[PDB]
mmCIF file of C-alpha atoms and ligand atoms in Angstrom:
data_model
loop_
_atom_site.group_PDB
_atom_site.id
_atom_site.type_symbol
_atom_site.label_atom_id
_atom_site.label_comp_id
_atom_site.label_asym_id
_atom_site.label_seq_id
_atom_site.Cartn_x
_atom_site.Cartn_y
_atom_site.Cartn_z
ATOM 1 C CA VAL A 1 71.109 79.350 69.296
ATOM 2 C CA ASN A 2 71.013 77.027 66.642
ATOM 3 C CA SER A 3 70.046 76.559 62.845
ATOM 4 C CA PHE A 4 66.922 75.609 63.082
ATOM 5 C CA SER A 5 64.382 77.799 61.285
ATOM 6 C CA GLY A 6 60.894 78.107 60.873
ATOM 7 C CA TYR A 7 59.044 76.619 64.368
ATOM 8 C CA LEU A 8 56.872 76.651 67.016
ATOM 9 C CA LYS A 9 58.351 76.993 70.198
ATOM 10 C CA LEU A 10 55.738 74.373 72.526
ATOM 11 C CA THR A 11 58.023 74.677 75.690
ATOM 12 C CA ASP A 12 60.571 75.575 76.758
ATOM 13 C CA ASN A 13 62.689 72.478 75.046
ATOM 14 C CA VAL A 14 60.381 71.453 71.994
ATOM 15 C CA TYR A 15 60.003 73.237 69.058
ATOM 16 C CA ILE A 16 58.148 71.588 65.833
ATOM 17 C CA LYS A 17 57.245 72.388 62.175
ATOM 18 C CA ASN A 18 55.277 71.255 58.866
ATOM 19 C CA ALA A 19 58.187 69.438 57.297
ATOM 20 C CA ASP A 20 60.361 66.542 55.381
ATOM 21 C CA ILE A 21 62.517 65.335 57.604
ATOM 22 C CA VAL A 22 65.429 64.192 54.729
ATOM 23 C CA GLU A 23 64.935 68.379 53.495
ATOM 24 C CA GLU A 24 65.117 69.645 56.887
ATOM 25 C CA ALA A 25 68.209 66.966 57.320
ATOM 26 C CA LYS A 26 70.155 67.694 54.003
ATOM 27 C CA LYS A 27 69.213 71.286 54.879
ATOM 28 C CA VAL A 28 70.238 72.166 58.368
ATOM 29 C CA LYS A 29 73.069 68.890 58.978
ATOM 30 C CA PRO A 30 71.815 67.957 62.317
ATOM 31 C CA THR A 31 74.288 67.074 64.895
ATOM 32 C CA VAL A 32 71.505 64.235 65.258
ATOM 33 C CA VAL A 33 68.244 62.779 63.191
ATOM 34 C CA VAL A 34 66.444 60.495 64.538
ATOM 35 C CA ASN A 35 65.305 57.795 62.502
ATOM 36 C CA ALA A 36 62.035 55.731 63.379
ATOM 37 C CA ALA A 37 63.196 52.709 63.441
ATOM 38 C CA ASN A 38 62.758 48.899 63.563
ATOM 39 C CA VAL A 39 64.589 46.404 65.421
ATOM 40 C CA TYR A 40 65.804 44.993 61.945
ATOM 41 C CA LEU A 41 66.741 48.644 61.169
ATOM 42 C CA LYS A 42 64.993 47.168 57.819
ATOM 43 C CA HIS A 43 64.489 50.891 56.541
ATOM 44 C CA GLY A 44 61.678 49.764 54.014
ATOM 45 C CA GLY A 45 58.755 52.678 54.399
ATOM 46 C CA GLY A 46 57.957 55.344 56.030
ATOM 47 C CA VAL A 47 60.151 58.056 57.870
ATOM 48 C CA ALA A 48 63.287 55.278 57.636
ATOM 49 C CA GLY A 49 62.690 54.350 53.727
ATOM 50 C CA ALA A 50 62.523 57.692 53.114
ATOM 51 C CA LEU A 51 66.412 58.659 55.400
ATOM 52 C CA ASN A 52 67.589 55.669 54.161
ATOM 53 C CA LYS A 53 66.829 56.217 50.162
ATOM 54 C CA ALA A 54 68.243 60.282 51.085
ATOM 55 C CA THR A 55 71.568 58.244 52.011
ATOM 56 C CA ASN A 56 71.525 56.300 48.441
ATOM 57 C CA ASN A 57 71.121 52.816 51.060
ATOM 58 C CA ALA A 58 74.448 53.205 52.949
ATOM 59 C CA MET A 59 72.168 53.241 55.088
ATOM 60 C CA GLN A 60 71.150 50.381 54.888
ATOM 61 C CA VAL A 61 73.743 49.354 53.782
ATOM 62 C CA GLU A 62 75.654 50.284 57.547
ATOM 63 C CA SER A 63 72.984 48.929 59.318
ATOM 64 C CA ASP A 64 73.119 45.514 58.477
ATOM 65 C CA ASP A 65 76.281 45.631 59.848
ATOM 66 C CA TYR A 66 75.103 46.461 62.469
ATOM 67 C CA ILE A 67 72.661 43.585 62.619
ATOM 68 C CA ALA A 68 74.687 41.433 62.222
ATOM 69 C CA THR A 69 77.183 41.874 65.098
ATOM 70 C CA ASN A 70 75.410 43.114 67.305
ATOM 71 C CA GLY A 71 71.681 41.005 66.846
ATOM 72 C CA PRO A 72 67.951 43.762 66.860
ATOM 73 C CA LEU A 73 67.040 45.983 68.601
ATOM 74 C CA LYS A 74 64.669 46.586 71.659
ATOM 75 C CA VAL A 75 61.184 48.220 71.295
ATOM 76 C CA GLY A 76 61.610 51.626 72.995
ATOM 77 C CA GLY A 77 65.682 50.913 72.090
ATOM 78 C CA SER A 78 67.874 52.819 70.248
ATOM 79 C CA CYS A 79 71.357 52.410 69.007
ATOM 80 C CA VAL A 80 74.031 55.504 67.411
ATOM 81 C CA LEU A 81 75.545 54.834 63.350
ATOM 82 C CA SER A 82 76.139 57.235 60.910
ATOM 83 C CA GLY A 83 74.229 60.108 59.752
ATOM 84 C CA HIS A 84 75.845 59.706 56.540
ATOM 85 C CA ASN A 85 74.974 62.737 54.221
ATOM 86 C CA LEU A 86 72.457 64.132 56.315
ATOM 87 C CA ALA A 87 73.600 64.413 59.730
ATOM 88 C CA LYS A 88 76.838 63.721 61.826
ATOM 89 C CA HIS A 89 74.751 61.108 63.605
ATOM 90 C CA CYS A 90 71.809 59.238 63.186
ATOM 91 C CA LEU A 91 69.978 58.081 66.257
ATOM 92 C CA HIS A 92 68.060 54.648 65.856
ATOM 93 C CA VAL A 93 65.007 54.732 68.020
ATOM 94 C CA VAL A 94 62.337 51.621 68.097
ATOM 95 C CA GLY A 95 58.901 52.950 69.340
ATOM 96 C CA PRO A 96 56.157 50.429 69.669
ATOM 97 C CA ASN A 97 55.213 49.002 66.138
ATOM 98 C CA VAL A 98 50.502 49.341 67.118
ATOM 99 C CA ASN A 99 50.098 47.207 63.661
ATOM 100 C CA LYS A 100 52.348 44.701 65.667
ATOM 101 C CA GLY A 101 49.999 44.399 68.779
ATOM 102 C CA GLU A 102 53.424 46.165 70.765
ATOM 103 C CA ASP A 103 52.627 48.203 73.924
ATOM 104 C CA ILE A 104 52.561 51.856 73.205
ATOM 105 C CA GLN A 105 53.449 52.407 76.952
ATOM 106 C CA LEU A 106 57.230 51.552 75.270
ATOM 107 C CA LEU A 107 56.692 54.477 73.910
ATOM 108 C CA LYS A 108 58.283 57.338 76.957
ATOM 109 C CA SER A 109 60.805 54.207 77.179
ATOM 110 C CA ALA A 110 61.468 55.114 73.343
ATOM 111 C CA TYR A 111 61.609 58.668 73.799
ATOM 112 C CA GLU A 112 63.844 58.259 76.991
ATOM 113 C CA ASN A 113 67.468 57.570 74.233
ATOM 114 C CA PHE A 114 66.443 61.387 73.377
ATOM 115 C CA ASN A 115 67.579 62.988 76.942
ATOM 116 C CA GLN A 116 71.630 61.157 75.712
ATOM 117 C CA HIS A 117 71.793 64.213 73.247
ATOM 118 C CA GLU A 118 71.485 68.219 73.648
ATOM 119 C CA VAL A 119 69.994 69.391 70.399
ATOM 120 C CA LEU A 120 67.793 66.821 67.921
ATOM 121 C CA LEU A 121 66.169 66.649 64.864
ATOM 122 C CA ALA A 122 63.286 63.949 64.994
ATOM 123 C CA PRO A 123 60.178 62.750 63.602
ATOM 124 C CA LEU A 124 57.114 61.918 66.729
ATOM 125 C CA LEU A 125 58.251 58.316 66.954
ATOM 126 C CA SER A 126 55.368 55.679 66.479
ATOM 127 C CA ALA A 127 53.388 57.916 64.368
ATOM 128 C CA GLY A 128 52.901 57.537 60.872
ATOM 129 C CA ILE A 129 52.215 53.988 59.769
ATOM 130 C CA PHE A 130 53.253 52.684 63.062
ATOM 131 C CA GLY A 131 49.812 54.086 64.168
ATOM 132 C CA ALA A 132 50.073 55.194 66.675
ATOM 133 C CA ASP A 133 47.829 58.611 68.465
ATOM 134 C CA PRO A 134 50.161 61.576 66.533
ATOM 135 C CA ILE A 135 48.207 63.983 69.123
ATOM 136 C CA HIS A 136 49.487 61.059 72.390
ATOM 137 C CA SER A 137 53.346 60.795 70.289
ATOM 138 C CA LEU A 138 53.702 64.006 70.978
ATOM 139 C CA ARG A 139 52.545 64.827 74.507
ATOM 140 C CA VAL A 140 54.934 61.671 76.050
ATOM 141 C CA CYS A 141 57.491 63.707 73.627
ATOM 142 C CA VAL A 142 57.162 66.347 75.769
ATOM 143 C CA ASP A 143 56.389 65.252 78.686
ATOM 144 C CA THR A 144 59.581 62.817 78.779
ATOM 145 C CA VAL A 145 62.473 64.977 76.717
ATOM 146 C CA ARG A 146 64.431 68.170 78.916
ATOM 147 C CA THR A 147 66.960 67.471 75.615
ATOM 148 C CA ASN A 148 66.295 69.930 72.904
ATOM 149 C CA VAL A 149 64.054 68.104 70.417
ATOM 150 C CA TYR A 150 62.779 69.941 66.806
ATOM 151 C CA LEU A 151 59.905 67.804 65.870
ATOM 152 C CA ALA A 152 59.464 67.581 61.695
ATOM 153 C CA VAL A 153 56.059 66.482 60.436
ATOM 154 C CA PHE A 154 55.466 65.730 57.368
ATOM 155 C CA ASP A 155 52.181 65.515 57.088
ATOM 156 C CA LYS A 156 50.323 69.749 57.171
ATOM 157 C CA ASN A 157 46.949 68.421 58.230
ATOM 158 C CA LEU A 158 48.346 67.068 60.916
ATOM 159 C CA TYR A 159 51.133 69.333 62.289
ATOM 160 C CA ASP A 160 47.641 72.138 62.345
ATOM 161 C CA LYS A 161 45.470 69.667 64.181
ATOM 162 C CA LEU A 162 48.407 69.279 66.658
ATOM 163 C CA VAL A 163 49.576 72.041 67.129
ATOM 164 C CA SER A 164 45.230 74.048 67.508
ATOM 165 C CA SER A 165 45.247 70.689 69.338
ATOM 166 C CA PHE A 166 48.095 71.409 71.712
ATOM 167 C CA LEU A 167 47.567 71.986 76.089
HETATM 168 C C1 LIG B 1 53.774 61.220 57.605
HETATM 169 N N1 LIG B 1 52.984 61.597 58.771
HETATM 170 C C2 LIG B 1 51.948 60.654 59.588
HETATM 171 C C3 LIG B 1 54.568 60.679 60.240
HETATM 172 C C4 LIG B 1 55.207 61.073 59.999
HETATM 173 C C5 LIG B 1 55.103 59.928 61.508
HETATM 174 O O1 LIG B 1 55.019 60.684 62.952
HETATM 175 N N2 LIG B 1 56.027 60.613 59.300
HETATM 176 C C6 LIG B 1 57.232 61.115 59.184
HETATM 177 N N3 LIG B 1 57.398 62.381 59.723
HETATM 178 C C7 LIG B 1 58.353 63.541 59.294
HETATM 179 N N4 LIG B 1 59.175 63.112 58.261
HETATM 180 C C8 LIG B 1 59.206 62.021 56.919
HETATM 181 N N5 LIG B 1 59.295 61.864 56.121
HETATM 182 C C9 LIG B 1 59.065 60.353 55.738
HETATM 183 C C10 LIG B 1 58.044 60.467 56.520
HETATM 184 C C11 LIG B 1 58.138 60.925 57.982
HETATM 185 CL CL1 LIG B 2 55.161 57.034 58.590
#
């Protein structure tokens, strides 16, 4: 039993809700919140900009030190950093950005990072401003993630389309 509330159950392990991931994380304070990161951990917009703003830029400061030490992530890769005031940990995961010409096949690799954590609050990877089809992202999530994932879909219209189209 966990404290996530109001989710629709899609499969044994995947749950979904129309919600603002910032507000959800603040309410639940999950062990792991997933950020829709880029390889430079530059949290400018989309989920990343919103999560970073909610940390008063502390996420960006921490991320800049991470990059200075380790260099960029790989597309499809991840790193674990602090969750600041939002969660215990933030799993920064880089899905492919179609608006940059990146290989959509890497979306499965991106979701594989979730399997290293028993329970996560997460967005749909490569959706929104990353330019991929969210129906596809949800399908890859369901077919790749085996741990317990609570998906927050900000757009209510998109959420209804995702539920109504789910196979
Ligand atoms: C907007 N939508 C079409 C894309 C999704 C990523 O697929 N973006 C989010 N999902 C959940 N919470 C969020 N807060 C801020 C942005 C955001
Ligand atoms: Cl977005």
